[PDB]
Design a protein around this ligand. Structure first.
Ligand SMILES: [Cu+2]
Ligand SMILES: [Cu+2]
Lengths: 313, 321
C-alpha cells in the first residue's frame, strides 16, 4: 500500500499491516509492554522465519496476476539475427565463508573524559570467487544491434529430487545480471564478470574509513562516488550456497533487443526520479506461464547451459 | 368525539385484555357490527377491512390466547392489517367499532400491538394517552415470581403487593436493563418509528435511519456508563465466529406461552431453522461493511448510490436494521 494507491480506503494495506500484525504477536493486547518485534522494522525482519512465510504469500498474490497472461509466442521472444552460440563460465563457482568485522562503538555510551576503547564485532559471511562469463554469439544481422544480456540462474531437481519444468522452475530463478551491450555484425564472444554484475554492490567502506578520508580532504584541497547509489544485494550473495558435493543449476541466457528495451532512456537506483531504463516487464521473459518448453527452446536468442556450484568447507 | 371519550373507549378496549370484554357497549358492537356494510367510513372503500375479513373468514389468522412476537413475519402481517383498518377510519364510529369487533376475535398481541401503533400514528388519535404496557400486559415486564404471587393472591382473593427482585455476576448493572421505563421507551421508540413503515400509511418518518443509528448508540453509551460505575468493563462486541461468552436466565414468563428459554454460557451460535443461517449474517455483515468501505451503497439495478455525504448515515441505517 504505498501512496500511489487507487483506493486505500478499500484495499487498505495487506503487506505493511501484515508487518505490524506478525510483530505484536508476542503481546497483542499489550499487557506486557514488550517493544515492537523483529518484523516491524526493516533492518531486522529477515531475521524472523515467518518473514519469508509472509512474503511467499504476498508473492503468489502477484503470481496470480502475473500468470493470467497468455504465454509468449515464438515471434514473441525472437530477436532475429542474434543467436546465442555458446555460454561458458570461465573460472569456478565456488562459494565459501569469509569473515568480516564491524565496530560496536556507537553502541557503548562513553560520555566525557573517560576515553574511547576500541571494541569490535566479527561475523561470518558467505562468499564466492569472481568468475567470468564467456557468452559466444553471432549477429546474423547485417547491422550492429543493441542487446540486453539477461541472465537468470534457475533450478533443476526437487529435494525429493523430482526435477522441475521451467514452469515449475521459471518462477524459482534468481536474477544474476542484466546489461546492455552493442553486438557487432558477426562472431563476437562477450566476456563479463562476477564483478560487473548489475544486481550487486560491494561491501561498504567502514565508518572510520569514511571519517579518515573525509577528514583528509579537508586539510587537503572525494570520490568513492561508488557508494552514493546503493540498491543491490551483496556481491558475496551473488550465487547461492550450495552443496559441498555440488549442485547443478541451469543458466539462462536470454538476449533481447536493446532498441525496444531501452526504447526510451543512475538508472539502476532511480532514487531521484530517474526512469527505469529497461521497458520489458520484470523477470522477462520467465515471468509468464511457459506451458510447453518446446518454445523457449526455439528462439535463437535464448540459450541454456548447466553450471555447477561447489561449497568449500 | 371529545377525548375523555376517545380516551375512555381506549381504556375499555385495553382492560383485562386476556378475556372477552365486560363493557356491554363493546360487545353488542362486537356482535352486531359488520366492517363491510358501509364502505364509506373507510378512506379505502374498505380494501383493508375486506382483507382482514377474508383472513378472519378462511380463519387463517393467529389464534387467541397464544403468544406472539413482532419478529414473526406472519404474526406481524396480521397485527399490521388491524393497523391498516383502524388507520383508514374517517372518525371514531369506525375505530371503536373495529377495535371491538376485532378485539374480540383477533389475538391479543396483534391486538394490543395494533391498537397502540394505530393510536400513535393514525390521524384520529390525538387526544389520547395510552396506559403503560407494564400494567396492560404485566407478564412481559414482571418477574416470574411476582407473577405467581399475583396468581395466588387471586386464587385466594386476598390482596397484596409484592416486592420484585432483579453477587455472582453482572446482574449488577441489571437495574438499567430491567427498568419498566427503559423497556417502555425501547418499545415506544419502535412504535414511533417502526421498521415496517411504508409511506403509503400517510406521511414519512423523517430521519428514521440516523434516529435508528443514534437511539441505539445512546442505549449502548448509557449502558457502557452504568457498567463503568460498577467496576465493570465496557462491553464486548458480539462476533458470529466466537462463543456467546455471557448467557443469562431471564426467569420471566409469557401469559399464554410458557417460560422464556434460557441460555447456558460459553455457547456456540447455531444455525436456526426458519430464520437464517449463521453464515447468512457473516455475509450480510460483509455486504454492509463494503458499502461503508467503498463510499457507496449499490441498489438492485447496480446503481451505486453515494453515501460519502450527510444523508449518508441514514441511507446506512435503512440497510442495517
Ligand atoms: Cu515486506
Ligand atoms: Cu431497538
Amino acid at each position: 500500500s504505498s501512496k500511489y494507491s487507487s483506493n486505500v480506503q478499500y484495499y487498505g494495506s495487506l503487506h505493511n499491516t501484515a508487518h505490524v500484525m506478525l510483530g505484536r504477536q508476542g503481546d497483542p493486547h499489550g499487557k506486557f509492554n514488550l517493544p515492537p518485534g523483529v518484523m516491524e522494522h526493516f533492518e531486522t525482519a529477515t531475521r524472523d522465519p515467518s518473514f519469508f512465510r509472509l512474503h511467499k504469500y504476498m508473492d503468489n498474490i502477484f503470481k496470480k496476476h502475473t500468470d493470467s497472461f497468455p504465454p509468449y509466442t515464438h515471434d514473441n521472444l525472437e530477436f532475429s539475427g542474434m543467436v546465442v552460440n555458446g555460454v561458458a563460465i570461465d573460472g569456478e563457482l565456488i562459494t565459501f565463508f569469509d569473515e568480516f568485522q564491524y565496530s560496536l562503538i556507537n553502541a557503548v555510551d562513553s560520555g566525557e573524559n573517560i576515553e574511547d576503547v576500541e571494541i569490535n564485532a566479527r561475523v561470518h559471511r558467505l562468499n564466492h570467487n569472481e568468475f567470468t562469463y564467456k557468452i559466444t554469439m553471432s549477429n546474423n544481422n547485417d547491422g550492429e544491434r543493441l542487446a540486453t544480456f539477461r541472465i537468470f540462474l534457475c533450478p533443476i531437481e526437487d529435494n525429493n529430487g523430482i526435477t522441475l519444468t521451467l514452469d515449475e522452475a521459471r518462477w524459482f530463478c534468481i536474477e544474476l545480471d542484466k546489461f546492455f551491450q552493442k553486438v557487432p555484425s558477426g562472431p563476437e564472444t562477450i566476456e563479463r564478470s562476477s564483478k560487473d554484475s548489475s544486481v550487486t554492490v560491494p561491501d561498504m567502506p567502514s565508518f572510520q574509513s569514511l571519517k579518515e578520508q573525509a577528514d583528509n580532504a579537508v586539510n587537503g584541497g572525494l570520490d568513492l562516488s561508488a557508494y552514493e547509489r546503493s540498491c543491490g544485494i551483496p556481491d558475496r550473495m551473488l550465487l547461492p550456497k550450495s552443496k559441498p558435493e555440488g549442485m547443478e543449476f541451469n543458466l539462462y541466457v536470454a538476449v533481447t533487443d536493446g532498441d525496444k528495451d531501452t526504447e526510451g532512456h543512475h538508472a539502476q537506483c532511480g532514487v531521484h526520479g530517474e526512469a527505469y531504463p529497461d521497458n520489458r516487464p520484470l523477470g522477462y521473459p520467465l515471468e509468464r506461464r511457459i506451458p510447453d518448453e518446446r518454445v523457449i527452446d526455439g528462439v535463437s536468442n535464448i540459450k541454456h547451459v548447466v553450471v555447477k556450484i561447489v561449497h568449500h568447507l | 368525539t371529545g377525548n375523555a371519550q376517545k380516551q375512555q373507549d381506549i381504556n375499555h378496549l385495553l382492560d383485562k385484555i386476556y378475556e372477552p370484554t365486560k363493557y356491554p357497549d363493546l360487545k353488542d358492537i362486537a356482535e352486531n357490527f359488520n366492517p363491510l356494510g358501509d364502505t364509506s367510513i373507510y378512506n379505502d372503500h374498505g380494501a383493508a377491512v375486506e382483507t382482514l375479513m377474508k383472513e378472519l373468514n378462511d380463519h387463517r389468522l393467529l389464534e387467541q390466547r397464544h403468544w406472539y412476537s413482532l419478529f414473526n413475519t406472519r404474526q406481524r402481517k396480521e397485527a399490521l392489517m388491524l393497523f391498516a383498518v383502524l388507520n383508514q377510519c374517517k372518525e371514531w364510529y369506525c375505530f371503536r367499532s373495529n377495535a371491538a369487533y376485532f378485539r374480540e376475535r383477533m389475538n391479543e398481541g396483534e391486538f394490543v400491538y395494533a391498537l397502540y401503533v394505530s393510536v400513535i400514528h393514525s390521524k384520529l388519535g390525538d387526544g389520547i394517552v395510552l396506559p403503560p404496557l407494564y400494567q396492560i400486559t404485566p407478564h412481559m415486564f414482571t418477574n416470574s415470581e411476582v407473577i405467581d404471587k399475583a396468581y395466588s393472591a387471586k386464587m385466594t382473593q386476598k390482596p397484596g403487593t409484592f416486592n420484585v427482585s432483579f453477587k455472582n455476576r453482572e446482574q449488577r448493572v441489571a437495574y438499567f436493563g430491567e427498568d419498566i421505563g427503559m423497556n417502555i421507551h425501547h418499545v415506544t421508540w419502535h412504535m414511533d418509528f417502526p421498521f415496517w413503515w411504508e409511506d403509503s400509511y400517510g406521511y414519512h418518518l423523517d430521519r428514521k435511519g440516523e434516529l435508528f443509528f443514534w437511539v441505539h448508540h445512546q442505549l449502548t453509551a448509557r449502558f457502557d456508563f452504568e457498567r463503568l460505575s460498577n467496576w465493570l468493563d465496557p462491553v464486548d462486541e458480539l462476533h458470529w465466529d466466537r462463543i456467546i461468552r455471557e448467557g443469562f436466565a431471564p426467569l420471566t414468563s409469557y401469559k399464554y406461552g410458557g417460560e422464556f428459554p434460557v441460555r447456558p454460557d460459553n455457547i456456540h451460535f447455531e444455525d436456526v431453522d426458519g430464520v437464517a443461517h449463521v453464515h447468512d449474517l457473516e455475509i450480510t455483515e460483509s455486504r454492509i461493511h463494503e458499502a461503508i468501505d467503498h463510499g457507496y451503497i449499490t441498489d438492485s439495478d447496480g446503481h451505486t448510490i453515494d453515501i460519502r455525504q450527510p444523508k449518508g448515515i441514514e441511507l446506512l441505517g435503512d440497510i442495517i436494521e
